[PDB]
Structures are given as C-alpha cells and as structure tokens.
C-alpha cells in the first residue's frame, strides 16, 4: 500500500513510520513545511503508525533527540516514539479488510488528517488545538499533551486489569476530537476500507 505524507503545518516536522519491532519503508523523515513523503507498506501489516515529531536535531549517523515522539534518538524510527504523539493506526489486509484510526492514547502533540485516497472508505481528523487547552497536569514542557496514563500511571488510566472507565482527563480529548481514541476501551472509532486502499496522513490539515 502507498502513504503520502504531508507536512501542511508551518515548522519543520520529522515524520516516522513503524510497526513496533521495525521501521516501516525507510523510518523517518524530515518535513519541511509543504513537503510531502511517499512511502510503501507491504500488504498485510499489523499495527503499523505513523507519527510526527517535533523539535529534534541529528547529526550525521542520524543521532539526535526530538522533544515530542522521540523513537530511541534515530532518525529512522524502527520502535514507537514517547509519548505525547497523536498516532495515526492501521492494519492491512485483515480477511479482506484495512482498519484505520486516529489515537489520543498516546497523548497529543500535532493536528492531524488521515484519509484513503482510494474510495469506499471515509477519513478521520482530530485537527483541534489540543495543546493550547490541554489541562495543566498533563502539559508537557517540550510540548504537546499527554494523556493520563503516561503522567499518572495508575490502573484507571492505563485500563491495565482491562477494565476501566472514562476519566475526567480522556474526556478532555474526546470531547476536542470525537473521532479518536480517547483512552483504550472507548467506543471504537476504527474505519473499514477496503483491503489494499491507500492512504494520505496530513499532519496540520487545517492550519
């Protein structure tokens, strides 16, 4: 499957690309503003994201550090970042089938569109200004806002006995994007496409 990856947002973002346990194409990218990434994801992954991360430096090994979504210092990400990092999601070909979704699990740290480019399938955006109202407890200095489990670390956050409810904190972001994760039991907002659709991740969509 292709991914376009679109930097619309005004500062430099560095892209990353990762199924976990491996980088997915080449990892990770800078993105200027306006410039776009296209990337290929062989069928059948499994939990694969896509993410930005903001403020990061490397040298020339492609060694550094990012404030927000920082995957072990590399450029090219070959695990999943630190959170606050707003998660774009997929599986491909599931028995004929691609699940999508946007996630606040993880907290928050750029506006984000994820749309098929392909049809039979609607996209997904949660394109609210989440770090300027994010709560004073879960602020992140280097930026963005994490979610609850990620600061607090209890059992009601993190749903570790697999059950919990929704908090005060995951209501916050639920009721800024309605059409992401707010915390791990939530109401599914997972979309069906078509198995072996294409997609296009813009990070600022509107602004």
């Known amino acids: 499957a292709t ?4 930097n619309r947002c005004s500062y430099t973002v560095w892209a990353a690309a990762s199924k976990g346990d491996a980088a997915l194409d080449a990892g ?5 503003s306006g410039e776009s990434w296209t990337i290929n994801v062989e069928p ?4 694969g994201k896509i993410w930005a991360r903001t403020d990061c430096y490397f040298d020339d090994s492609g060694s550094g550090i990012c404030k927000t979504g920082d995957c072990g210092g590399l450029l090219r990400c070959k695990r999943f ?10 599986s491909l070909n599931q028995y004929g089938k691609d699940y999508i979704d ?3 699990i993880k907290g928050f740290n750029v506006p984000m569109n994820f749309s098929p480019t392909t049809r039979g399938c609607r996209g997904v955006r949660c394109a609210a200004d989440i770090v300027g109202q994010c709560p004073a407890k879960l602020k992140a200095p280097g930026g963005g806002c994490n979610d609850a489990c990620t600061v607090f670390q ?3 956050y993190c ?5 919990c409810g929704p908090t005060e904190y995951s209501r916050f972001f639920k009721r800024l994007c309605p059409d992401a994760f707010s915390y791990v039991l939530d109401k599914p ?14 990070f600022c969509p509107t602004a």
Not at 28 to 32: C, T, V, Y
């Open 159 to 163: 749903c570790t006995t697999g059950k």
């Open 189 to 202: 907002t997972t979309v069906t496409c078509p198995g072996s659709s294409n997609y296009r991740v813009t």
């Open 102 to 104: 946007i996630s606040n």
């Open 81 to 90: 970042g630190r959170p606050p990092t707003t998660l774009a999601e997929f």
């Open 3 to 6: 991914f376009e990856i679109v």
């Open 154 to 156: 209890t059992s009601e």
């Open 28 to 32: 990770g990218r800078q993105l200027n």
């Open 44 to 47: 059948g992954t499994n939990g």
